[PDB]
XYZ file of C-alpha atoms in Angstrom:
725
model
C 51.385 -31.699 17.056
C 53.348 -30.819 13.897
C 52.547 -27.120 14.364
C 53.904 -27.386 17.916
C 57.161 -28.958 16.770
C 57.187 -26.352 13.996
C 57.403 -23.497 16.474
C 59.470 -25.482 19.033
C 62.288 -26.124 16.561
C 62.816 -22.365 16.364
C 62.659 -21.987 20.154
C 64.977 -25.010 20.722
C 67.225 -24.463 17.711
C 70.402 -24.163 19.777
C 70.101 -27.331 21.840
C 69.074 -29.647 18.988
C 72.227 -28.473 17.257
C 74.466 -28.937 20.279
C 73.022 -32.336 21.086
C 72.933 -33.825 17.583
C 76.450 -32.652 16.818
C 77.717 -34.040 20.142
C 75.804 -37.260 19.523
C 77.334 -38.017 16.138
C 80.885 -37.734 17.407
C 79.923 -39.519 20.626
C 78.034 -42.222 18.696
C 81.042 -42.514 16.469
C 83.566 -43.272 19.202
C 81.199 -45.483 21.198
C 80.063 -47.227 18.013
C 83.237 -47.801 16.050
C 84.729 -49.152 19.240
C 82.004 -51.111 20.971
C 78.549 -52.726 20.873
C 79.112 -55.740 18.557
C 79.685 -58.465 21.149
C 77.873 -61.536 19.926
C 79.185 -65.014 19.120
C 78.999 -66.639 15.710
C 78.411 -70.218 16.868
C 74.732 -70.501 17.539
C 72.614 -68.843 14.828
C 71.251 -72.104 13.404
C 70.876 -74.597 16.296
C 67.441 -73.679 17.698
C 65.221 -76.200 19.418
C 64.440 -79.754 18.152
C 65.811 -83.040 19.417
C 69.167 -82.786 17.609
C 70.132 -79.669 19.561
C 69.221 -81.129 22.913
C 71.273 -84.194 21.929
C 74.175 -81.867 21.030
C 74.186 -80.089 24.379
C 73.925 -83.363 26.203
C 76.692 -84.885 24.084
C 79.109 -82.025 24.590
C 78.194 -81.977 28.293
C 79.070 -85.655 28.816
C 81.875 -86.539 26.336
C 83.161 -82.982 25.863
C 83.620 -80.823 22.778
C 85.884 -82.325 20.099
C 88.534 -79.790 19.050
C 90.663 -81.973 16.742
C 88.654 -80.950 13.639
C 89.758 -77.265 13.590
C 92.977 -77.007 11.554
C 94.866 -79.582 9.418
C 98.237 -78.382 8.118
C 99.923 -80.129 5.194
C 103.738 -80.106 5.475
C 105.850 -80.607 2.377
C 109.660 -80.920 2.498
C 111.557 -78.675 0.041
C 113.722 -79.943 -2.783
C 111.280 -82.861 -3.355
C 112.501 -84.634 -0.215
C 110.108 -87.206 1.194
C 108.517 -86.869 4.630
C 110.458 -89.985 5.751
C 113.647 -87.855 5.771
C 114.660 -88.154 9.401
C 116.785 -85.003 9.743
C 113.976 -82.890 8.430
C 111.451 -84.487 10.765
C 113.640 -83.652 13.761
C 114.024 -80.148 12.387
C 110.324 -79.523 12.067
C 109.688 -81.200 15.419
C 111.991 -78.727 17.110
C 110.166 -76.026 15.137
C 106.905 -77.511 16.402
C 108.326 -77.645 19.906
C 109.328 -74.008 19.420
C 105.763 -72.981 18.725
C 104.717 -75.154 21.636
C 107.181 -73.128 23.662
C 105.624 -69.845 22.468
C 101.942 -70.817 22.725
C 101.450 -73.196 25.676
C 98.276 -71.189 26.498
C 96.656 -71.773 23.081
C 97.542 -75.333 22.029
C 96.933 -78.560 23.961
C 99.221 -80.544 21.665
C 99.732 -82.194 18.328
C 98.687 -85.739 17.331
C 99.451 -87.802 14.277
C 101.592 -90.482 12.697
C 104.721 -88.400 13.407
C 104.143 -88.885 17.150
C 104.226 -92.673 16.620
C 105.972 -93.845 13.396
C 106.001 -97.469 14.647
C 102.363 -97.888 15.594
C 99.962 -100.825 15.256
C 96.910 -98.613 14.855
C 95.313 -99.465 11.452
C 93.742 -96.078 10.572
C 97.015 -94.363 11.435
C 98.895 -96.654 9.108
C 96.173 -95.777 6.573
C 96.975 -92.078 7.070
C 100.342 -92.221 5.268
C 100.019 -91.973 1.513
C 100.985 -95.034 -0.516
C 104.068 -93.211 -1.815
C 105.276 -91.912 1.571
C 105.502 -88.355 0.163
C 102.891 -86.457 2.220
C 101.565 -86.297 5.770
C 99.383 -83.715 7.527
C 99.040 -82.870 11.201
C 96.234 -81.467 13.359
C 96.939 -78.627 15.813
C 94.037 -78.320 18.284
C 93.634 -74.896 19.895
C 92.246 -73.803 23.254
C 88.867 -72.126 23.501
C 85.225 -72.712 24.543
C 83.654 -70.980 21.490
C 84.708 -70.197 17.936
C 85.569 -66.562 18.801
C 88.225 -67.422 21.352
C 89.429 -70.089 18.908
C 89.690 -67.557 16.090
C 91.527 -65.085 18.315
C 93.950 -67.882 19.145
C 94.444 -68.677 15.508
C 95.265 -65.012 14.989
C 97.738 -65.248 17.899
C 99.511 -68.258 16.354
C 99.184 -67.733 12.573
C 102.612 -65.914 12.302
C 104.658 -68.652 13.898
C 102.655 -71.338 12.156
C 103.133 -69.641 8.789
C 106.867 -69.397 9.455
C 107.542 -73.165 9.466
C 109.307 -74.789 6.492
C 111.024 -71.473 5.767
C 107.700 -69.740 5.170
C 106.560 -72.267 2.505
C 103.458 -73.590 4.302
C 99.832 -73.365 3.090
C 97.298 -72.974 5.941
C 93.743 -74.306 5.367
C 90.967 -75.553 7.610
C 88.233 -74.003 9.725
C 90.187 -71.118 11.231
C 92.213 -70.197 8.098
C 88.779 -69.976 6.394
C 87.047 -67.967 9.122
C 90.022 -65.579 8.848
C 89.686 -65.521 5.072
C 85.967 -64.699 5.412
C 86.299 -61.805 7.807
C 89.171 -60.556 5.698
C 86.862 -60.559 2.718
C 84.672 -58.483 5.026
C 87.369 -55.871 5.440
C 88.276 -55.990 1.726
C 84.643 -55.482 0.819
C 84.144 -52.591 3.162
C 87.252 -50.751 1.995
C 86.521 -51.675 -1.637
C 83.057 -50.169 -1.180
C 84.314 -46.933 0.427
C 86.895 -46.427 -2.373
C 84.671 -47.540 -5.244
C 81.315 -46.270 -3.941
C 81.883 -42.812 -2.405
C 83.474 -41.558 -5.666
C 80.826 -43.254 -7.826
C 77.988 -41.975 -5.726
C 79.725 -38.602 -5.799
C 79.723 -38.380 -9.575
C 76.218 -39.847 -9.876
C 74.969 -37.174 -7.466
C 76.889 -34.407 -9.273
C 75.478 -35.446 -12.667
C 71.846 -35.290 -11.497
C 72.080 -31.898 -9.796
C 73.493 -28.431 -10.492
C 74.272 -27.288 -6.925
C 76.813 -28.674 -4.472
C 74.627 -28.768 -1.327
C 71.827 -30.848 -2.902
C 74.405 -33.519 -3.751
C 76.287 -33.124 -0.428
C 73.130 -33.564 1.665
C 72.618 -37.307 1.052
C 76.224 -37.829 2.184
C 75.677 -35.869 5.380
C 72.568 -37.958 6.012
C 74.587 -41.111 5.335
C 77.331 -40.336 7.868
C 74.777 -39.457 10.574
C 72.845 -42.616 9.728
C 75.602 -45.138 10.457
C 76.562 -43.208 13.607
C 73.005 -43.287 14.863
C 72.545 -46.890 13.877
C 75.595 -47.896 15.863
C 74.143 -45.911 18.748
C 70.747 -47.568 18.413
C 72.392 -50.989 18.475
C 74.555 -49.965 21.439
C 71.274 -49.284 23.259
C 69.750 -52.498 21.907
C 72.684 -54.591 23.163
C 71.677 -54.160 26.787
C 68.739 -56.539 26.152
C 69.426 -58.216 22.762
C 72.610 -58.261 20.659
C 73.166 -57.838 16.876
C 76.012 -59.382 14.848
C 77.517 -60.596 11.558
C 78.087 -59.705 7.891
C 74.379 -58.870 8.163
C 75.345 -55.491 9.620
C 77.019 -53.821 6.595
C 74.193 -55.109 4.344
C 71.814 -53.360 6.807
C 73.832 -50.164 6.512
C 73.959 -50.190 2.732
C 70.249 -50.997 2.344
C 69.074 -48.515 4.980
C 71.437 -45.789 3.743
C 70.122 -46.427 0.239
C 66.400 -46.250 0.829
C 67.105 -43.414 3.267
C 68.762 -41.494 0.448
C 65.685 -42.301 -1.636
C 63.479 -40.767 1.109
C 65.641 -37.639 1.278
C 65.484 -37.556 -2.526
C 61.728 -37.375 -2.439
C 62.015 -34.717 0.244
C 64.448 -32.481 -1.686
C 62.413 -32.955 -4.855
C 59.043 -32.175 -3.256
C 60.635 -29.161 -1.536
C 62.115 -27.787 -4.777
C 58.696 -28.357 -6.401
C 56.812 -26.378 -3.728
C 59.437 -23.644 -3.880
C 59.075 -23.435 -7.665
C 55.296 -23.177 -7.467
C 55.763 -20.007 -5.363
C 54.789 -21.055 -1.815
C 56.501 -19.667 1.261
C 58.746 -21.929 3.369
C 56.264 -22.577 6.197
C 53.250 -23.538 4.080
C 55.389 -25.637 1.775
C 57.066 -27.476 4.664
C 53.730 -28.150 6.418
C 52.070 -29.770 3.424
C 55.200 -31.658 2.388
C 55.617 -32.918 5.973
C 52.124 -34.444 6.157
C 52.354 -35.482 2.471
C 55.627 -37.302 2.949
C 55.132 -38.344 6.541
C 51.789 -39.968 5.697
C 53.522 -41.966 2.962
C 56.451 -42.957 5.202
C 54.060 -44.043 7.984
C 52.143 -46.216 5.532
C 55.416 -47.627 4.146
C 56.630 -48.393 7.661
C 53.468 -50.081 8.851
C 53.685 -52.172 5.650
C 57.318 -53.152 6.387
C 56.327 -54.050 9.947
C 53.612 -56.350 8.678
C 56.313 -57.825 6.414
C 58.726 -58.447 9.284
C 56.553 -59.581 12.228
C 55.547 -62.931 10.711
C 59.192 -64.004 10.992
C 58.740 -63.340 14.698
C 55.843 -65.813 14.445
C 58.539 -68.470 13.674
C 61.893 -67.750 15.300
C 65.412 -68.638 14.040
C 68.140 -66.188 15.007
C 70.291 -64.601 12.283
C 67.052 -63.711 10.487
C 65.374 -62.402 13.632
C 68.349 -60.120 14.329
C 68.126 -58.785 10.792
C 64.391 -58.046 10.967
C 65.118 -56.269 14.236
C 67.794 -54.231 12.505
C 65.481 -53.354 9.636
C 62.723 -52.038 11.923
C 65.132 -49.766 13.837
C 66.815 -48.658 10.605
C 63.623 -47.673 8.835
C 62.176 -45.998 11.931
C 65.423 -44.002 12.564
C 65.442 -43.078 8.829
C 61.917 -41.699 9.020
C 62.690 -39.774 12.249
C 65.724 -38.099 10.693
C 63.706 -37.488 7.522
C 60.914 -35.667 9.299
C 63.043 -33.899 11.923
C 66.648 -32.754 11.359
C 66.465 -32.629 7.555
C 63.123 -30.861 7.281
C 64.140 -28.247 9.862
C 67.500 -27.592 8.114
C 65.833 -27.135 4.759
C 63.331 -24.781 6.452
C 65.836 -22.219 7.698
C 67.912 -21.579 4.570
C 65.206 -22.406 2.030
C 65.934 -21.596 -1.598
C 69.061 -19.668 -0.738
C 70.649 -23.074 -0.272
C 70.985 -22.866 -4.103
C 72.584 -19.443 -4.427
C 76.339 -19.572 -5.012
C 76.918 -22.519 -7.317
C 80.094 -23.927 -8.899
C 81.907 -20.602 -9.095
C 85.147 -22.485 -9.864
C 64.924 -32.470 -22.257
C 63.102 -33.794 -19.221
C 59.901 -32.466 -20.736
C 60.554 -34.046 -24.142
C 60.940 -37.421 -22.488
C 57.909 -36.745 -20.263
C 55.908 -36.091 -23.457
C 57.252 -39.298 -25.017
C 56.018 -41.069 -21.851
C 52.582 -39.470 -22.260
C 52.381 -40.431 -25.932
C 53.444 -43.952 -25.053
C 50.949 -44.378 -22.258
C 48.238 -43.154 -24.636
C 49.449 -45.784 -27.135
C 49.287 -48.506 -24.498
C 45.810 -47.643 -23.241
C 44.886 -47.259 -26.955
C 45.892 -50.860 -27.762
C 46.082 -52.690 -24.438
C 45.698 -56.323 -25.625
C 48.974 -55.922 -27.528
C 50.525 -55.657 -24.026
C 48.199 -57.930 -21.985
C 48.776 -60.914 -24.299
C 52.645 -61.072 -24.077
C 52.731 -60.283 -20.343
C 50.348 -63.076 -19.322
C 52.004 -65.551 -21.659
C 55.368 -64.568 -20.216
C 53.743 -65.510 -16.866
C 53.371 -69.241 -17.410
C 57.130 -69.777 -17.968
C 58.084 -68.083 -14.703
C 56.954 -70.948 -12.543
C 58.188 -73.653 -14.901
C 61.695 -73.396 -13.372
C 60.401 -72.906 -9.798
C 59.526 -76.581 -9.398
C 63.187 -77.560 -9.898
C 64.245 -76.324 -6.435
C 66.483 -78.134 -3.986
C 67.567 -77.011 -0.516
C 70.875 -77.615 1.156
C 73.458 -76.530 3.771
C 76.757 -74.761 4.209
C 79.972 -76.304 2.841
C 83.369 -75.409 1.342
C 81.623 -74.836 -2.035
C 80.424 -71.457 -0.590
C 83.673 -69.716 -1.610
C 84.881 -68.440 -4.989
C 86.743 -70.966 -7.074
C 90.014 -68.976 -7.038
C 90.434 -69.035 -3.237
C 93.630 -70.756 -2.123
C 92.056 -72.399 0.983
C 89.402 -74.222 -1.097
C 91.956 -75.730 -3.426
C 94.138 -76.731 -0.462
C 91.068 -78.383 1.050
C 90.066 -80.143 -2.155
C 93.622 -81.491 -2.399
C 93.391 -82.767 1.159
C 90.011 -84.334 0.376
C 91.378 -86.195 -2.632
C 94.744 -87.158 -1.204
C 93.278 -88.493 2.075
C 89.710 -89.708 1.455
C 87.823 -91.085 4.406
C 89.008 -88.678 7.102
C 86.257 -86.105 6.438
C 82.861 -87.368 7.591
C 79.455 -85.996 8.588
C 78.090 -88.817 10.780
C 74.656 -89.292 12.353
C 74.789 -89.577 16.148
C 72.800 -91.926 18.368
C 72.809 -90.258 21.828
C 71.668 -92.715 24.457
C 70.224 -91.663 27.822
C 68.626 -93.643 30.638
C 66.269 -91.928 33.039
C 67.212 -94.189 35.982
C 70.729 -92.687 35.919
C 72.111 -96.181 36.498
C 74.851 -97.515 34.138
C 74.080 -99.116 30.775
C 74.793 -102.807 30.641
C 77.071 -104.319 27.977
C 74.105 -106.395 26.742
C 71.971 -103.224 26.337
C 74.740 -101.945 24.048
C 75.098 -105.108 21.971
C 71.289 -105.015 21.657
C 71.145 -101.398 20.490
C 73.951 -102.128 18.058
C 72.140 -105.188 16.694
C 69.053 -103.091 16.072
C 71.060 -100.340 14.430
C 72.560 -103.140 12.294
C 69.136 -104.381 11.255
C 68.933 -101.328 8.903
C 70.918 -101.609 5.661
C 72.446 -98.766 3.681
C 74.885 -97.496 6.295
C 78.611 -97.077 5.610
C 81.068 -99.834 6.551
C 84.512 -98.772 5.340
C 86.267 -101.502 7.351
C 84.027 -104.235 5.866
C 83.011 -105.709 9.259
C 79.917 -105.114 11.401
C 81.778 -105.952 14.643
C 83.782 -102.712 14.222
C 80.723 -100.645 13.360
C 79.010 -98.221 15.771
C 82.051 -97.629 17.910
C 81.810 -95.654 21.151
C 82.779 -91.984 20.921
C 86.210 -91.155 22.393
C 86.203 -89.583 25.840
C 88.286 -86.395 26.098
C 89.882 -85.353 29.419
C 87.570 -82.292 29.771
C 84.158 -84.037 29.720
C 82.185 -85.025 32.762
C 82.046 -88.725 32.018
C 78.576 -89.993 32.994
C 77.678 -93.687 32.462
C 74.083 -92.379 32.199
C 74.826 -91.089 28.650
C 76.667 -92.811 25.797
C 76.766 -91.929 22.084
C 77.605 -93.917 18.954
C 77.910 -92.425 15.455
C 78.287 -93.338 11.815
C 78.253 -91.565 8.447
C 76.236 -92.182 5.314
C 77.445 -93.553 1.978
C 75.244 -91.048 0.073
C 74.052 -87.902 1.823
C 70.905 -88.137 -0.290
C 69.647 -91.244 1.479
C 69.959 -89.226 4.584
C 66.361 -88.153 4.259
C 65.233 -91.701 3.738
C 67.447 -93.145 6.407
C 66.611 -90.274 8.755
C 63.005 -91.449 8.791
C 64.267 -94.952 9.420
C 66.382 -93.786 12.378
C 63.576 -91.803 14.045
C 61.194 -94.756 13.638
C 63.239 -97.138 15.814
C 61.730 -98.315 19.151
C 64.443 -98.309 21.817
C 64.443 -100.550 24.908
C 61.744 -100.063 27.551
C 63.208 -97.763 30.163
C 65.923 -96.057 28.044
C 65.527 -93.199 25.498
C 67.471 -92.632 22.247
C 68.054 -89.264 20.578
C 68.883 -89.058 16.879
C 71.273 -86.175 16.089
C 73.990 -84.864 13.797
C 74.255 -82.012 11.310
C 72.211 -83.778 8.580
C 69.295 -84.012 11.028
C 69.387 -80.380 12.136
C 69.405 -79.318 8.463
C 66.619 -81.651 7.421
C 64.519 -80.616 10.419
C 64.901 -76.922 9.718
C 64.023 -77.676 6.072
C 60.944 -79.654 7.130
C 59.858 -77.034 9.632
C 60.202 -74.297 6.987
C 58.232 -76.118 4.300
C 55.748 -76.974 7.067
C 55.310 -73.296 8.072
C 55.552 -71.817 4.589
C 51.762 -71.943 3.955
C 50.875 -70.234 7.253
C 53.607 -67.608 6.485
C 52.074 -66.843 3.084
C 48.628 -66.805 4.684
C 49.556 -64.179 7.260
C 51.454 -62.203 4.640
C 48.476 -62.094 2.294
C 45.721 -61.386 4.812
C 47.767 -58.685 6.551
C 48.727 -56.903 3.339
C 45.153 -57.197 2.053
C 43.575 -55.673 5.158
C 46.200 -52.884 5.160
C 45.449 -52.113 1.542
C 41.725 -52.295 2.416
C 42.490 -49.535 4.928
C 44.584 -47.388 2.607
C 42.035 -47.818 -0.234
C 38.285 -47.894 0.303
C 37.574 -51.000 -1.801
C 37.616 -54.730 -1.023
C 38.388 -56.085 -4.523
C 41.353 -53.811 -5.285
C 43.470 -55.019 -2.337
C 42.925 -58.709 -3.218
C 43.822 -57.850 -6.809
C 47.065 -56.126 -5.833
C 47.778 -59.067 -3.491
C 47.402 -61.553 -6.355
C 49.566 -59.438 -8.695
C 52.193 -59.175 -5.949
C 52.075 -62.970 -5.531
C 52.520 -63.314 -9.287
C 55.552 -60.978 -9.115
C 56.925 -63.035 -6.231
C 56.556 -66.346 -7.982
C 58.088 -64.866 -11.173
C 61.056 -63.591 -9.174
C 61.805 -66.922 -7.512
C 61.213 -68.659 -10.851
C 63.793 -66.504 -12.598
C 66.184 -67.027 -9.698
C 65.753 -70.822 -9.916
C 66.151 -70.467 -13.686
C 69.565 -68.832 -13.393
C 70.905 -70.311 -10.120
C 69.815 -73.972 -10.208
C 70.329 -74.961 -13.857
C 73.489 -72.836 -14.221
C 72.616 -70.507 -17.092
C 74.930 -67.609 -16.220
C 77.372 -69.308 -13.768
C 80.446 -69.188 -16.023
C 80.091 -65.435 -16.648
C 79.527 -64.122 -13.108
C 82.031 -66.682 -11.702
C 80.184 -68.816 -9.125
C 78.954 -72.326 -8.742
C 75.206 -73.108 -8.810
C 73.927 -74.897 -5.707
C 70.785 -75.010 -3.505
C 69.890 -71.973 -1.421
C 69.271 -71.624 2.345
C 65.434 -71.563 2.529
C 65.016 -68.902 5.301
C 66.991 -66.522 3.095
C 64.357 -67.047 0.404
C 61.782 -66.220 3.078
C 63.588 -63.020 3.849
C 63.860 -62.061 0.139
C 60.146 -62.743 -0.352
C 59.232 -60.485 2.559
C 61.555 -57.682 1.434
C 60.423 -57.819 -2.223
C 56.732 -57.913 -1.154
C 57.025 -54.946 1.192
C 59.100 -52.963 -1.331
C 56.683 -53.446 -4.259
C 53.818 -52.698 -1.937
C 55.399 -49.483 -0.656
C 55.952 -48.222 -4.227
C 52.353 -49.245 -5.028
C 51.034 -47.235 -2.072
C 53.099 -44.213 -3.100
C 51.811 -44.360 -6.671
C 48.177 -45.301 -6.266
C 48.170 -42.977 -3.207
C 48.784 -40.099 -5.553
C 46.367 -41.452 -8.139
C 43.646 -41.581 -5.441
C 44.540 -38.143 -4.052
C 44.029 -36.650 -7.523
C 40.887 -38.716 -8.111
C 39.580 -37.494 -4.726
C 40.263 -33.980 -6.060
C 37.649 -34.536 -8.811
C 38.438 -34.478 -12.537
C 38.052 -37.298 -15.031
C 39.962 -40.601 -15.079
C 42.195 -39.526 -17.970
C 43.061 -36.323 -16.129
C 43.968 -38.126 -12.887
C 46.061 -40.584 -14.898
C 47.950 -37.898 -16.820
C 48.559 -35.803 -13.732
C 49.855 -38.851 -11.839
C 52.188 -40.117 -14.560
C 53.338 -36.556 -15.032
C 53.950 -35.438 -11.459
C 55.904 -38.672 -10.823
C 57.663 -39.792 -14.007
C 60.774 -37.825 -13.045
C 60.597 -39.074 -9.439
C 60.276 -42.805 -10.306
C 63.095 -42.230 -12.857
C 65.423 -40.748 -10.228
C 64.467 -43.344 -7.651
C 65.400 -45.884 -10.362
C 68.763 -44.251 -11.126
C 69.456 -44.416 -7.357
C 68.434 -48.036 -7.146
C 70.758 -48.720 -10.084
C 73.713 -46.971 -8.456
C 73.215 -48.945 -5.231
C 72.756 -52.051 -7.341
C 76.129 -51.417 -8.921
C 77.456 -51.169 -5.399
C 76.077 -54.541 -4.596
C 77.505 -55.971 -7.759
C 80.705 -54.765 -6.097
C 79.600 -56.162 -2.702
C 81.554 -59.429 -3.243
C 80.795 -62.693 -1.387
C 79.242 -65.360 -3.584
C 76.154 -65.972 -1.484
C 75.796 -62.220 -1.401
C 76.230 -62.035 -5.128
C 73.292 -64.421 -5.523
C 71.076 -62.589 -3.091
C 72.008 -59.014 -4.014
C 71.741 -59.856 -7.721
C 68.348 -61.449 -7.124
C 67.017 -58.308 -5.465
C 68.517 -55.952 -8.082
C 67.183 -57.897 -11.073
C 63.715 -58.496 -9.628
C 63.446 -54.905 -8.386
C 64.324 -53.466 -11.813
C 62.019 -55.917 -13.611
C 59.054 -55.201 -11.384
C 59.648 -51.428 -11.243
C 59.941 -51.148 -15.012
C 57.386 -53.768 -16.185
C 54.843 -54.673 -13.525
C 53.820 -51.256 -12.267
C 53.701 -49.500 -15.624
C 51.893 -52.263 -17.503
C 49.487 -53.634 -14.865
C 48.282 -50.356 -13.317
C 46.965 -48.417 -16.343
C 45.424 -51.605 -17.775
C 43.681 -52.661 -14.554
C 42.305 -49.215 -13.801
C 41.006 -49.036 -17.398
C 39.384 -52.463 -17.021
C 37.641 -51.420 -13.800
C 36.207 -48.233 -15.202
C 33.713 -46.490 -12.955
C 34.077 -49.467 -10.590
C 37.262 -47.699 -9.375
C 35.183 -45.464 -7.061
C 32.711 -47.845 -5.416
C 32.814 -48.336 -1.618
C 30.362 -49.770 0.911
C 28.742 -47.007 2.924
C 29.413 -48.472 6.360
C 33.077 -48.812 5.451
C 33.249 -45.166 4.418
C 31.776 -44.142 7.716
C 34.305 -46.374 9.513
C 37.066 -44.641 7.567
C 35.621 -41.274 8.586
C 35.074 -42.273 12.277
C 38.773 -43.023 12.718
C 40.003 -39.570 11.657
C 41.744 -40.495 8.394
C 41.228 -38.998 4.978
C 43.478 -35.921 4.661
C 44.296 -36.720 1.038
């Protein structure tokens, strides 16, 4: 058991050193190079009819690659686009890029390719003043990654047209801007964070090693996480911006764990215990808390596996492997290292009031317990207002509003969207499939169109129903099948989408043929519906699982349901404050971002994380309160000893959470600013208001009830082998 590994680490000291040092360099080269090999197109389309209709549509008519990049060309010296010499010049320039990238571009299409054309919409492309015209440059590729790599192959030559004066916007210029914000945020973090975390560590300690240890743990952590994921990638892959967030969160709570390990070790050394005895009780003492915290986090993450998605699933998978690897390094490499040197790790030093505050905390807790209603009244009245704002919530999807207002690409896009209205559309698709496989008659088409025309409220920009519900264009790379045909059309107001969506699904097609209703508005409204359909069951599993787990940690049945209710209150209050600052806009002008609806599954993730985090700190605290109560003594003694042996710990764990929170205020990315700020604010509010107000008051209210426990449940607890408090 632990005694065995205790003696084995001395007998195998040489190989654990040779392996773990070899592993970090090996994991570094294999990790920095390889293992992240997953696509970015496909984290949201999961099941439903709209996705089947999208695969069938792409399979028959072929993927449409014209809506990738739109470049706006402007002649210098205020010359108009009708200038013929310039057009020839840029055409040769265009032909020059066509000469250099035949393997990436199919070709260019637009009014320039046919100045004298009878096509209405193309004559509607030129602006009424004949001063601006934009062209589309489709690129080769079967997925967005190959496309992006082609954009990076062509961006130089495309950015060199018009003597360098050319603004590049669109899908690929934006994807490039996003991943570049990734690199800017990583480097910003490594040049703003490692010095800040260096001075914060140096200002809390007095010896170099104690402050240098969390950094050593941090470097080994990312190396071992990249190695874990390299092993994970043979079965399931991990991707995205969601990886650095996983490294900052894991490295943070991991430093918290090693903070509680260095603190408990210094404490046992100061009481006068030898290294072995101290390490054995700290091991079990910490390890039992980490095991409880981990099983709690697992119960917080598995329900998402009850309802799959993708991006979220990959993150919950990353969290489980990150917390488990953190616990393993906490109870293996670190504990052994601290065991050999011991207190002479603090010997050399930099050669070249905590008790007064702890007493103020004791006098203040005695004042609170002395006049509790003066605290209970304001807290519970503060409670009603938390959910007032919660009701206001709206749910939406991704769009160009997701970037900061000073980004060049967004303004270029907004200019395109105001200069050339009507070209950008999000249409609903009517995918038609016959099971006989035989062709669809012209009459069957005029009949389907007449029934789609029996529903009002659908856009008609031409002002003519004969031209409505056109057939989709057939590209030269689709397996044309007369068994499938699709017609599409946008909405005048995306808000009537929900109403009209129910009208589209309710239509009865002809006898033998089947109709599929698709398009991006339907996938979004079906994920929204499925989430608000499975939200009650999610909360149900979350509550029953956390209550039984607390019924196992504690011996009571009322205390777990009480903590569950107070954790639900904290949850509701957190999402109510978030809706109160992100939906109505109070605070948007200062932090520089635009208020808009949130992506619901991210609110599910934040609820699970906050719940598990507050529960872990509740188990750590009441776990020490119960250990002291189980050691005898009166209630006031157990209270004082608890809020005395941990005031300095919860204070340092808070300083740490604030340093990391300042690193997430520097984490950039607007949708990351909303999430990271939500977690930081709620975490500080709960960890400085909820725990310290609610706990002393509730325990006081219970009184002697705090110790009751059914007899058969105490024998069950004893029959499993648990109770080494």
